[PDB]
Each structure stands twice: as C-alpha cells, then as structure tokens.
Amino acid sequence: GITVLTHSELSAEIGVTDSIVVSSELVMPYTVGTWLRGVAANWSKYSWLSVRYTYIPSCPSSTAGSIHMGFQYDMADTVPVSVNQLSNLRGYVSGQVWSGSAGLCFINGTRCSDTSTAISTTLDVSKLGKKWYPYKTSADYATAVGVDVNIATPLVPARLVIALLDGSSSTAVAAGRIYCTYTIQMIEPTA
Amino acid sequence: GITVLTHSELSAEIGVTDSIVVSSELVMPYTVGTWLRGVAANWSKYSWLSVRYTYIPSCPSSTAGSIHMGFQYDMADTVPVSVNQLSNLRGYVSGQVWSGSAGLCFINGTRCSDTSTAISTTLDVSKLGKKWYPYKTSADYATAVGVDVNIATPLVPARLVIALLDGSSSTAVAAGRIYCTYTIQMIEPTA
Amino acid sequence: GITVLTHSELSAEIGVTDSIVVSSELVMPYTVGTWLRGVAANWSKYSWLSVRYTYIPSCPSSTAGSIHMGFQYDMADTVPVSVNQLSNLRGYVSGQVWSGSAGLCFINGTRCSDTSTAISTTLDVSKLGKKWYPYKTSADYATAVGVDVNIATPLVPARLVIALLDGSSSTAVAAGRIYCTYTIQMIEPTA
Amino acid sequence: GITVLTHSELSAEIGVTDSIVVSSELVMPYTVGTWLRGVAANWSKYSWLSVRYTYIPSCPSSTAGSIHMGFQYDMADTVPVSVNQLSNLRGYVSGQVWSGSAGLCFINGTRCSDTSTAISTTLDVSKLGKKWYPYKTSADYATAVGVDVNIATPLVPARLVIALLDGSSSTAVAAGRIYCTYTIQMIEPTA
Amino acid sequence: GITVLTHSELSAEIGVTDSIVVSSELVMPYTVGTWLRGVAANWSKYSWLSVRYTYIPSCPSSTAGSIHMGFQYDMADTVPVSVNQLSNLRGYVSGQVWSGSAGLCFINGTRCSDTSTAISTTLDVSKLGKKWYPYKTSADYATAVGVDVNIATPLVPARLVIALLDGSSSTAVAAGRIYCTYTIQMIEPTA
Amino acid sequence: GITVLTHSELSAEIGVTDSIVVSSELVMPYTVGTWLRGVAANWSKYSWLSVRYTYIPSCPSSTAGSIHMGFQYDMADTVPVSVNQLSNLRGYVSGQVWSGSAGLCFINGTRCSDTSTAISTTLDVSKLGKKWYPYKTSADYATAVGVDVNIATPLVPARLVIALLDGSSSTAVAAGRIYCTYTIQMIEPTA
C-alpha cells in the first residue's frame, strides 16, 4: 500500500550579499515545499527514493555572488560557517549566482541532455539512517531537539545547507531560486 | 479526411518589470498565433498532436528578469499569482530573460542537439480531456465562461500560464519572445 | 452490458421546389426515426457504430430537382444557406431527385454491388467528440441550446444537413425519401 | 506525471426503516470519503481505474431490512423511487441488512476467495463518458446543475444510488456501513 | 437481424404465510418484468437463450417460511397444489425464505464463485416446443386459452411455478424478491 | 543464532456496548500474549516475520455489535476516536461481533480454504521502521513515552487498534476473543 509520487516545486527564493549567509532546510516533506507539505500530511510515514535541489538563476550575467549547497546527514552536526567547511560536504556544489540555467531540465520532468553547468545536488538515499521516516512538522522537530538533538536523527533524513556570499551589496540582491525535485513513497494513511 | 499541419510562429512579445505580472494564453488555434488562427478557421474541429511554447531572448546578458511558464488543463482552475504556485504546474519552466537561446532549434524545424538551457515547454496531449476540439474564438469562449466556467473545459484543451518578474525597472523592458511550434490535425472543413 | 442494434427505417419524406430549402436533422436516436426513438429511450446512453442516410427516389425521371446532404459535427456551426457552402461539408453528396435508386441495397441488409449512383452518406463515427452520448429528446436539446449552444456539442454527435432546390414548381413536389441505416450500441438501461 | 492511489475508507453509515428511503452519493473524490476528499484536492484532475462500494453489516441476524445499490451514469436521470426501478440499474445488488460479511476481503487489500454473498458493486470505468475528470466540490456541482443539469454530466462520472427498506421499525435501526475501495489516477497538481 | 439483449430485473415481491400459496408467472417478455415488457414489445418475435429466476431474501434469519420454484413447459398442465408435486418439476429448487443470498452474483452480471446455497433456477431453452415465439400480452394469452388451452402451448414457452408455505403467520410476511436474469434474442421489428 | 518460533495464543477477551470503545495493544512480545511474553523474555531482541490478529466470535447470531481492527505504525500517532478514522488504517477490518468463525483456520496451524468472512488482520512486517527490536516491557515503554513519545517509535514495531460499538446494551456483552498468531525470530539470549 505504497503511494508513489514524483513532483517538482519551488523550495526557496534566494538573495545574495557581500557577507556570507548560511541557511538550511530540513529534507523532509513538511519543509521541502508548500504543496508536498500539504499532500504528504495525509500519510504517516514516507521514504525518499530521490531528492534533488536545483538552483536556477534569475539575475543578470553581471551580478556578483556565488552559491553553495551541500547535505548533512547527522542532525547533531553543527551547521557550517565557511565555504571551506561546506565544500567537504557530500553533494557539494558551487556556482555563480547567474549560472545554473542548464539545471532546468531537472525541475521539468524532461530528459536532460548536457548538465555540466547545472547547480544541482541530490540526496544519498542509500546512506540514510533508515528507510521509513515519519511525517513530522517543524514544531515536532524543534520539540525533539529541545529534549536531546540525537532524538531528531531518526525523524529527519538529512539537512540541506546553503551558503551565499561574494555579492556586491550589503543588502540582498535577488539572485535566483531553489527548486526541489522529489520522488517520494508515502504509506500508512491518516485522518 | 485529416489535414495535418506542422508549423512554427510568433505567439507573444515579452517584457519584464520589477513587480510580478501573470498573463495567460488559451491553447487553441485562434489564440496561438495570427497565422494559424486564419488557417484553422477553415476547419470545424482540430486535435493537437503536439504543442510547444518556446521563449527566445532578445535582450542583453545584463538584463534583470526571470520568466516562468506552465500549463493548466482545467479552465476552472484559478490563474496562479505566485511563482511558488506556478512552479507546481505541469510543464513548468523558468529562466533568466536573457537565457533561452538554445531553444531556437525547436522553432526551426531543424534537428535539436543540446537543449539543456532551453526555456521551452510542451503540452501533454495524451492527458487532454478528449481528442477532437472545436475551433472556437475568444468571443465564443468568453460567452461560454459567462454562463458557467465548466462549459469551457470541453472547448479549450488547456491554458498556458506565463509569469514575469525580477526585472530592474517599473516600466517594461523588452526581454524576448514566445514562439509556438505546433503539429495540428484539422478536420471537417467549413465555409 | 452493451445491447447492439442494427436496423433501417424511414427518416424523412422529401419534397422539392424551385427556391432552395435547407433543413436539418439531429443525428440522435430520438430524431433519427420513430421506431428507434421508442426503442432507445429504454437505455440512458448510446454510441453510434455506424450511421448512414440514404436517399431513395419516388418520382419520374422527368422531375426537376436536386438534393444535397452533408454532416456538421459542431452544433454551434451555422446551418448552410447555399449549395456552395454545403458542398464543403464532410460526407457531401448531391444528385437528381429522380436518381439514387442504387442506394437501395444500403437500407436493405443485403450485400451491395455497384453503388456509384447512390445518394448516400455516412457519419464519421471515429471523429465524434466522444464515444457514449446520452439519450436526449428534442426538448432536452432545445433547452440546452437556449442556455448556451455549446452545452449541446456534448449531447448530440452531429447534424445532418439537407438541401433541396432546382425544382420546377413553387409548391413542393414529392421527390423521394430519406432512410436511416444505423448500427447503435445501447447501454445503461432505465425505467 | 500520474500519481496512482489505491485505498479503502468508510463512505456511509447505514440505517434501516419500514418505509423505503432512497439516497445517493456522487462518485467523485470529494464525496467518496473524507480522506480522499482531502488528498485528491491537491490535484486538478483524476481518473477512476476502479471504484467499488461494499456494504458490511453490523447488526443481528434477526434484523429486518434489505439494502439495494446501483449506479446511474447520467446526472440528468431521475433518482429511482422503487426497488423495481433500481433493480434495472447497472451494477445492482441487493441483500439482507445482516448479510454482506463476505465482502470484507474487498475493503482490505487482501486476496478474495468466495464472495458469493457479498453486497458489493463496482463502477464501469470503461463506459464512463470520458477519462479525465476535474476535481469538483459539492458546491461546484450544485451550481452547475442550477444552470443546466447537463453541464454536470462532464463533471461527475456517475452516481451511486442506495435504497433501504423492509425494516421492522419506523425509526432507523443501525444496520451497517458502506465502504469505498478505489484506485484513482491523479494528475495536474495544484496549489 | 437479431438483436441480443442481456439484462436482469425485478420480477416479483414475495411474502410468506402458514398455509401454502401457489402462484405462477408466464415465462414471456410481457410478464417477466416491466422493463423488458416495454423493450421487447418493439419486436414481433423472440427467443430465450437463457432465463433464470433467482430468489433473494430480505428477511431475518429467524423468519419462518420456505420457498419453492419449478418450471412447467405445457400450458395445459394443471398448476401444482403441493410441494410433493412441485418437487417433481424440472428445475425445482427449495429453500428457507431467509436463505438465498449467494444467488446475488446471478442478478449482477458478475462472475459467480460458490453458489451452493442459491435459490435459483434456469429454463431449459433446448427443450422448448420451438425456437421463435411471438410477443404476446396477458390479454392475448387469456383470449387464446378461453378458446382452447392448447392454442397457448405455441405462444408461451413455459410457466414458472412458485410456492410459499411454512410461515409462522396467517397474514403475509415480507420474505424476499424474485429477480429474472435473461438473455433474449429479439427479431422482426414492428411499429 | 536465530531461534524461530511460530505459535498462536489468546490475546484479548472482547465485549461490546452501545457506545464506541477504542482500545489498543502494543505489538510486541510482552503484550501479545502471556505465553510468548514469558518465552521471549529469555532473548534480548526479536523480529516479527509475521503477526496476525484474528477475532473469533463466541456470541449468538442475534447479538448486536460490530468490531473494528487496524494497525498504527507510528507510536506518536493519536489513537483514533471514530470508525471513520480507523477505517483509513492499514490492515483495517470490520465485522459483526457474531461473525468471524472462518478465521479459525488461522489460529490453528491448519491450511486455510475460504476465509472471505474472517475478521483477521496481519502486520506489514516489511514496512516496519527496522528489523531487530529489543524486548521491552510495558513499564519500559511507559517510561520512554514519558520522556518523549518519539523515543518509543524504535522500541515498538506497531500498535493494534481495536474499536467496539453498535452494541445493544450499555453494559458490556461478551462477544468474542482476539487471538494472536505469530512467527517470531528471537536472538541474543540473556539471563
């Protein structure tokens, strides 16, 4: 009784400044995108068959800035503070905030030809702690971390880490967007 | 007695501003392009074998702006108001208003090599309500909606939705053009 | 639970005058013939596998007049006003009101040899909007048109259009008859 | 981009009296069950691959009453008023309000052995007007009917009709429940 | 030019008392059920390929009563007066007025698994006097009998005989219903 | 060093009232049955290869009541409060409190023929959080829930949920019993 779902939605709008800014997203249906959030709530557990975050630029070629993405798979790990650290992450990618166009074929459900320049990264579903995760909210996760950070490792599969720097301005310039393209297995319906 | 027609024409000129602007085009011969409009009027019914909208830029690499396209297949659906919503659409594509050059091979009748960066989207002809649609004008559609919006679902196969934002100016800057590349079956001639 | 029915009955008596007279018949069981009307009412839906209207003359060889038949498949189409227009229709046939004898084999359930001269025309069942149509009365159709003509496109499969002109007299001379030879699938019985 | 979903939920609680009581349910995701209602709202269109309504008793063997179910596939059809009429319906089933236990394997996702006595009926998906239906609410349907009933035939695939009579009491006795077991194809996501 | 029709409708409501009550139904389209009566009137002759009467209970398990069915194939035969006699009939079946549930699959157009307990009986179409019978009314039959009973043997294929007894009450208790499930060949249309 | 054990024992006595009563059992050796509780304590960990709960009635056919069973696989899920909710559960079954006899072959170690009517449900061992669970007491579980409910998801594989209602009396009537039929792998002995 597995419902398989493949879909691709907006996950984050992205802006760039001159100082580094590190942010992060939990890789779970609640936080991935507003649509999936609503859909997957109707089931109790899920399993990621595939998760891919893809940056697509919206700015001029002349825009200063770079973007960096990587995954952490231990909720207890501290979020990185530098590109150096972040570069060691599994799935690390990096590029000009005006580059990344060739990643479009990933958010599309179309067959991908040359994606050399694509700023896209996928989750290692195979190396996840386990297979079936429960659907949990941000609130649920925050509560669990507040007791002990390790109680969370079984609730969320992973954490996407994003860093933006190298911008020309101290106030954020609109650079682009991050889209999540997932294939999810949902099971154990709930009312 | 099917007349098959494959052709590619201009469908829309495109301009970009700093506030989001959502527009939409009915995916039917009257509204697709001026040429096809005139041609297909000579038949009573048609079927799309293929429909593809392709954005081609005409602006500098330094032009701010992004463009977003997707299809809606229920005339009753409300037109989206945000990129977030629009990103959930079937056939969604997104890009810089200065990108999209590689989509040229689509509007061309030439064989396409690498189209990774192409801002192009095709209609799901297979998942259309039905096969043979009648040729209808804008007027015809407006009338039918005015009675009940659901009457229209059988008259138009789909709706193309376009969004433009992230521009640097409050008044529109010429960004590019959208071309429709269709293969249509026309039947049941009329005078 | 499909009841298949093949049958052939009188559908229209035909008279000819000197001025053109265009009339039309809905291609649906209620209006096709009095017998089928009564039969098919006992089911809720039907599908035409085959529909053929066949003119058979009853007049002298010396009778002036011609007859013209064609199908329209969009209820919204305006009924034609000239032979020129009507000639463009799908299934168009034309002949002397005293010709058409060789069409007899069609109304007969006998095997047809040479039908070169036959004034007979068949519906394109393949190109119909859809497959299963509901049984509807004239009243039902008139009501639906009165709201919006496009509501009717899903209720009737097609319209037979008949034109008679070239007659020698201002008052109608009996020319012949039109017989409908149909194969219909009836489903979903009703009380 | 089809999401296939198979599932089985409660659809109606059922009570029996001495006078006949005819009720009916639209066979569309909004009205089928509360869970599916919520889930399928997240898409724009659907197609039933399979729909099956299954009565399961909860009363004593000594309980007077019978139950009757059938499908209507034309929204314009008048709801039946007698068992006689209802018995002519496609998919008709009938039984004691205390019988129907053997239908349990249907609501279960288990393999079914002997279901001779099961009070269960399935929709003829093949003979539906068309394939892809839009997700519509009760409100949407009521509106559309209020204009012209025939507008609705394209919005809802069918109507389940239920009749209960032969009870021993003038006030309703709890007899059993009706469960819907569906396999649905959902497409064209929406926010 | 044979129209084949398969269908299943209500044929008789059934009540049980303490004294034996023998009733009977002619096995001809006029008397089989109201729906078929109307349909088949549109043809002149018919042939039964299959006829099956099926009792389905609607009463409590605690209801006293038994039901008995058999066919007579000579209109001149006198209707039986005892179970003993009736038991000799061809196609004889017997059961508790609260049994017979498993016969449901027969009235259904679904595939039948275990029907050991089913109170259902079929006509021996092979051993009928002849093949093509004329459509006749009750009036027609009554007239013909009034002249000589043997005139009727060619008009009606057979007679269903029903007996109900063993009830607990002297006034009839609602027990169940008899449904006819037929496959009929209709020929020689008529107006 | 795996000790495999297959066995079937009493798990719960069951009574029915007029108001709904929802109860639940943890699906772990301590709580499954008194015998297994004692046996499996001698090992440290286990894995369910198969778990099946089976209701067997002990009441008259005339007993009012129904019974409902389903599994929850997230200890944090709130126990259901209505049949409607419970019906959505994975493995859901429902029946008259006097039905369920045909489930006997499951508690038996005999080969099962027709189990259409059986009120029996099995655990989805495949979709369990993980494979090897530790043997834990009720006390152990209560403690762990008292800290944070999510700590428990790794200790207990699942929860059986039972609902009883539709009874004729406000004080419980003995209806039947629930038997657990398990195949367990026990490992890592302990003193």
Domain ranges of chain C: 1-191
CATH topology assigned to domain D1-191: Jelly Rolls (2.60.120)
Per the CB < 8 A criterion, the answer to whether F131 and F2 are in contact is no
CA end-to-end span of chain C, whole Å? 16
Out of F64, F93, F113, the one facing D60 most closely (by C-beta) is F64
> Hey, is the C-beta of E22 within 8 angstroms of any chain C C-beta?
no
Per the CB < 8 A criterion, the answer to whether B170 and B18 are in contact is yes
- Quote the DSSP letter at residue A60: -
Burial of E84 (0-12, 13-18, 19+ CB in 10 A): exposed
Coil, strand or helix at D151? helix
Nearest residue on chain A to F73, judged by CA atoms?
A: A188
Whose CA is closest to B2, among B131, B185, B134?
B185
Out of A1, A7, A42, the one facing D38 most closely (by C-beta) is A42
Q: How far apart are CA B122 and CA B116, in angstroms?
A: 15
Provide, as residue numbers in chain E, all residues whose Cβ is less than 8 Å from the Cβ of C42.
35, 38-39
User: Measured between CA atoms, how close is C169 to chain E, in angstroms?
Assistant: 34
Neighbours of chain E (3+ CB pairs under 8 A): C, D, F
Residue F187 pairs in a beta bridge with: F45
What does the block give as tokens for D158?
A: 């069918």
Contact D102 F94 (CB under 8 A): no
Out of E1, E42, E109, the one facing C109 most closely (by C-beta) is E1
What does the block give as tokens for D16?
A: 């029996």
Count of beta carbons in the 10 Å neighbourhood of residue B108:
13
Q: How far apart are CA C11 and CA B53, in angstroms?
A: 48
Burial of F78 (0-12, 13-18, 19+ CB in 10 A): exposed
- Quote the DSSP letter at residue D144: H
Which residue in the block uniquely carries the two structure tokens 């977030």?
B84
B66-72 and B159-165 strand pairing: antiparallel
* CA-to-CA dists, residue A29 to A182, B113, F97, angstroms: 10, 36, 40
Q: How far apart are CA C164 and CA C69, in angstroms?
A: 9
Provide, as residue numbers in chain D, all residues whose Cβ is less than 8 Å from the Cβ of B153.
134, 154
> Hey, is the C-beta of B144 within 8 angstroms of any chain C C-beta?
yes
Alpha helices in chain B (DSSP H): 29-32, 34-40, 83-86, 138-147, 149-152
> Taking CB atoms and an 8 Å cut-off, how many pairs form between chains A and B?
82
How far from chain centre, in Å, is Cα A132? 19
* CA-to-CA dists, residue F125 to C138, D155, F47, F158, angstroms: 61, 41, 9, 10
- Segment holding C40, helix H or strand E: helix C34-40
Contact A189 F90 (CB under 8 A): yes
Per the CB < 8 A criterion, the answer to whether D177 and D56 are in contact is yes
Contact E58 D93 (CB under 8 A): no
What does the block give as tokens for B81?
A: 């108001």
Contact C3 E5 (CB under 8 A): yes
What does the block give as tokens for A2?
A: 């597995």
Per the CB < 8 A criterion, the answer to whether F156 and F29 are in contact is no
> Hey, is the C-beta of E110 within 8 angstroms of any chain F C-beta?
no
Burial of B191 (0-12, 13-18, 19+ CB in 10 A): middle
Nearest residue on chain E to D83, judged by CA atoms?
A: E10
Contact F88 A190 (CB under 8 A): yes
> Hey, is the C-beta of D154 within 8 angstroms of any chain A C-beta?
no
Coil, strand or helix at A180? strand
How far from chain centre, in Å, is Cα C2? 24
**In the structure, do chain D and chain A come into contact, i.e. share 3 or more CB pairs under 8 Å?**
yes
Q: How many CA atoms lie within 13 A of F122 on its CB side?
A: 19
What does the block give as tokens for F140?
A: 């152990």
**In the structure, do chain C and chain B come into contact, i.e. share 3 or more CB pairs under 8 Å?**
yes
> Hey, is the C-beta of D83 within 8 angstroms of any chain E C-beta?
yes
Count of beta carbons in the 10 Å neighbourhood of residue C98:
20
Q: How far apart are CA E175 and CA E95, in angstroms?
A: 12
Per the CB < 8 A criterion, the answer to whether A172 and A67 are in contact is no
Contact D147 C147 (CB under 8 A): yes
Count of beta carbons in the 10 Å neighbourhood of residue A62:
12
Provide, as residue numbers in chain F, all residues whose Cβ is less than 8 Å from the Cβ of D113.
113-116
Phi, psi of F104 (to 5 degrees): -60, -40
The binding site of C consists of 74, 77, 135
What does the block give as tokens for E59?
A: 């009463």
Per the CB < 8 A criterion, the answer to whether C155 and C136 are in contact is yes
Whose CA is closest to A189, among A46, A5, A30, A49?
A46
Count of beta carbons in the 10 Å neighbourhood of residue D97:
29
Q: How far apart are CA D179 and CA D33, in angstroms?
A: 9
Nearest residue on chain E to D91, judged by CA atoms?
A: E108
D133-134 and D43-57 strand pairing: antiparallel
Provide, as residue numbers in chain C, all residues whose Cβ is less than 8 Å from the Cβ of B154.
129, 150, 153-154
Q: How far apart are CA A104 and CA F82, in angstroms?
A: 46
| Structure-determination approach | X-ray
Per the CB < 8 A criterion, the answer to whether D86 and D68 are in contact is yes
Contact D104 F84 (CB under 8 A): no
The binding site of F for Ca(2+) consists of 74, 77, 135
Q: How far apart are CA F57 and CA F76, in angstroms?
A: 31
Coil, strand or helix at D90? strand
Mapping DSSP onto H, E and C, the string for chain E reads: CCEEEEEEEEEEEEEECCCCEEEEEECCHHHHCHHHHHHHCCEEEEEEEEEEEEEEECCCCCCCCEEEEEEECCCCCCCCCCHHHHCCCEEEEEEECCCCHHHHHHHCCCCCCCCCCCEEEECCHHHCCCCCEECCCHHHHHHHHHHCHHHHCCCCCCEEEEEEECCCCCCCEEEEEEEEEEEEEEEEECC
* CA-to-CA dists, residue C50 to C10, C121, C125, C180, C185, angstroms: 16, 11, 7, 10, 10
Q: How far apart are CA B83 and CA E98, in angstroms?
A: 64
Q: How far apart are CA B65 and CA D141, in angstroms?
A: 41
F66-72 and F133-134 strand pairing: unpaired
Contact B114 A112 (CB under 8 A): no
Amino acid residing at C170: S
Per the CB < 8 A criterion, the answer to whether D119 and D103 are in contact is yes
Neighbours of chain C (3+ CB pairs under 8 A): B, D, E
**In the structure, do chain A and chain E come into contact, i.e. share 3 or more CB pairs under 8 Å?**
no
Mapping DSSP onto H, E and C, the string for chain F reads: CCEEEEEEEEEEEEEECCCCEEEEEECCHHHHCHHHHHHHCCEEEEEEEEEEEEEEECCCCCCCCEEEEEEECCCCCCCCCCHHHHCCCEEEEEEECCCCHHHHHHHCCCCCCCCCCCEEEECCHHHCCCCCEECCCHHHHHHHHHHCHHHHCCCCCCEEEEEEECCCCCCCEEEEEEEEEEEEEEEEECC
Q: How many CA atoms lie within 13 A of C64 on its CB side?
A: 12
Coil, strand or helix at D84? helix
* CA-to-CA dists, residue B177 to B35, B103, C40, D112, F122, angstroms: 16, 12, 54, 59, 60
> Hey, is the C-beta of D98 within 8 angstroms of any chain F C-beta?
yes
What does the block give as tokens for A120?
A: 């896209």
**In the structure, do chain C and chain A come into contact, i.e. share 3 or more CB pairs under 8 Å?**
no
Coil, strand or helix at A12? strand
Q: How far apart are CA B154 and CA B129, in angstroms?
A: 7
